[PDB]
Design a binder for this molecule. Sequence first.
Ligand SMILES: O=C(O)c1cccnc1
Ligand SMILES: O=C(O)c1cccnc1
Ligand SMILES: [Zn+2]
Ligand SMILES: [Zn+2]
Lengths: 208, 207
Amino acid sequence: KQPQNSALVVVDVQNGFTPGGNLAVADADTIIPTINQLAGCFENVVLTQDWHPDNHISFAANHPGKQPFETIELDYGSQVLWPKHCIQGTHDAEFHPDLNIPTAQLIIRKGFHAHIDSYSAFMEADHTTMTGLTGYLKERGIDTVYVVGIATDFCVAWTALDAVKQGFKTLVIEDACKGIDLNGSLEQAWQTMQQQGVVRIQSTDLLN
Amino acid sequence: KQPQNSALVVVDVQNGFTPGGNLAVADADTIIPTINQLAGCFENVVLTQDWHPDNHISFAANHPGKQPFETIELDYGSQVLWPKHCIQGTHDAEFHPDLNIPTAQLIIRKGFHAHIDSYSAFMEADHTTMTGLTGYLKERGIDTVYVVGIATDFCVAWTALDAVKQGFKTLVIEDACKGIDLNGSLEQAWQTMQQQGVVRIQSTDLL
Ligand SMILES: O=C(O)c1cccnc1
Ligand SMILES: O=C(O)c1cccnc1
Ligand SMILES: [Zn+2]
Ligand SMILES: [Zn+2]
């Protein structure tokens, strides 16, 4: 069992990002059993939820003339636009029915500001609005974060990279993640994470 | 329309503490519509969930020869013993079906250490284990906390009192709360809360 100063952060294991959902990442449901097992290795487990209002600025539907998977320039920089997904209170937003972590101690929703996305569970896309997560973990005596979930190259990568920025020892458990790979995002995410000192590990490194 | 520096904390609006549940507080379902309406006044809304393992020390069932509602002495002081309630993953632990706050931004579970209760969403019964809530709220720029839910004299009172300890301006919205009143606990929880400068308001004051 991992020590009290470690937490597992389970990123967006939601209907919306799994097969059948509005932004389904192929095979993303196959990581769930590994995640359920990993969470049993940990004393401390947080789960995140993309939690968008219908009018969110990340939906291509809210920008005249723009299509899913196009990028647009916002006050805070480049924003990829998406199909509508994980809208607050909808089926798409719920956790995947295979997810089974009764010991989870926190559920932190993100992306709820209409005008600011938040792939990261730690900081919003404006690079300035802090979500509360850093404060929560530090108060609990947590100094080490392992990140799993969906998508590797968006919410997992940005959560991991913000965890580093905020002072956490950060690791990503690769086989408990699944990626989208838009215009080469997946390899770039791995390169950036590795440059910034995120440790790339496999589930077998913890379970055995 | 409350400013960004204020948050509504919704305490344990769960099947377990409402009519039908394992630790049912009479009429406690009746506060839910007011709560739903109040959440609509706030930018920032946090929900709490009592979240006990089956093994939990607060259950009478785990102390042979003790009865629900009797008090025993633990390491950290007095502990009321209860019916089994709000066990992790069970129907009893779930939010009440009438609760409707899609804008809620956090759900914090408490009471999950087998050996330590946690009526308060800020600090556990041992007076020392901090739950993370203080840091989360301070990080978000929140300095004022309004508290609603169940029970007025336990999880609501302790949450409010710990919030004061931690430096928040603290209010409790009386008609959006419901109590248990064990041996005078209700009137006393109000006394203590006011002595400590918790503001007692009514939903109509906010709405
Ligand atoms: O990585 C995610 O979970 C994600 C991807 C696209 C949009 N919103 C969230
Ligand atoms: O106030 C509460 O929610 C409460 C009351 C008794 C036991 N556990 C929690
Ligand atoms: Zn999103
Ligand atoms: Zn309890």
